[PDB]
Design a protein around this ligand. Structure first.
Ligand SMILES: O=P(O)(O)Cc1ccccc1-n1cc(-c2ccccc2)nn1
Ligand SMILES: [Zn+2]
Ligand SMILES: [Zn+2]
Length: 231
């Protein structure tokens, strides 16, 4: 079963195999004074791996590479960061020193720079307008519009029907919006609806944090966001 925040000391990383050649990676990090889990994705592309998102920090991202080498044994050659916050680009310097080609949208790179976060080297063209989709090896990258952040991307794995929603999709146990300093509350449900309409065949939905589910995580997220908007 899926690794949980209480089972992973900070600094450690677990892998969870969803399908043939598709894994999630799970780490934990302290914010304020709580402990919180975070998901990313790993997708096999021939004899190499595509990493989606760092493991929230340099120390966790170094352990992520160690766990991959220990559990999978294939080289991580590219990585995509789905938005500019530290849970998605923190560790990008680690990835880069290990010879990983790091990528993010121009929006993400610009915002990471403004915010003082690590900046992926390569720019993902063709994702600046809501509804844009591009192919990236074994996945498709989709910009649904502004939601958790103005730059958030989601990732679909066609071969396995896996939708990685990143931090634009909440796990079921999250009933409140939390920190929305950089979210677009007014557009968030509209962006979620673009996800639903573009990936209605998705079978396994991974939130940015916590337990996977199905497409019902999209309506759950809409419910939470709309309830936060209303007070
Ligand atoms: O914003 P992201 O969703 O991606 C997570 C994140 C990442 C980095 C730093 C902080 C946080 N935050 C976590 C929370 C929170 C969530 C549920 C209950 C109580 C608090 N708020 N912020
Ligand atoms: Zn964020
Ligand atoms: Zn997050």
């Amino acid at each position: 079963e899926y690794p949980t925040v209480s089972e992973i000391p900070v600094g450690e990383v677990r892998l969870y195999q969803i399908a043939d050649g598709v894994w999630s990676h799970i780490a934990t990090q302290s914010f304020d004074g709580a402990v919180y889990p975070s998901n990313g994705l790993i997708v096999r592309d021939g004899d190499e791996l595509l990493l989606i998102d760092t493991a929230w920090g340099a120390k966790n991202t170094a352990a992520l590479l160690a766990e991959i080498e220990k559990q999978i044994g294939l080289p991580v050659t590219r990585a995509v960061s789905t938005h500019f916050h530290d849970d998605r680009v923190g560790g990008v310097d680690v990835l880069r020193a290990a010879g990983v080609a790091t990528y993010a949208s121009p929006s993400t790179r610009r915002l990471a720079e403004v915010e003082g976060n690590e900046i992926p080297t390569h720019s993902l063209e063709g994702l600046s307008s809501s509804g844009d989709a591009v192919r990236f090896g074994p996945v498709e990258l989709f910009y649904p519009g502004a939601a958790h952040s103005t730059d958030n991307l989601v990732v679909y794995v066609p071969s396995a029907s896996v939708l990685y929603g990143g931090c634009a999709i909440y796990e079921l146990s999250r009933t409140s919006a939390g920190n929305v300093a950089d979210a677009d509350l007014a557009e968030w449900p509209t962006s979620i609806e673009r996800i639903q309409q573009h990936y209605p065949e998705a079978q396994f939905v991974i939130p940015g944090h916590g337990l996977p589910g199905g497409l019902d995580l999209l309506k759950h997220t809409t419910n939470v966001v709309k309830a936060h908007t209303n007070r």
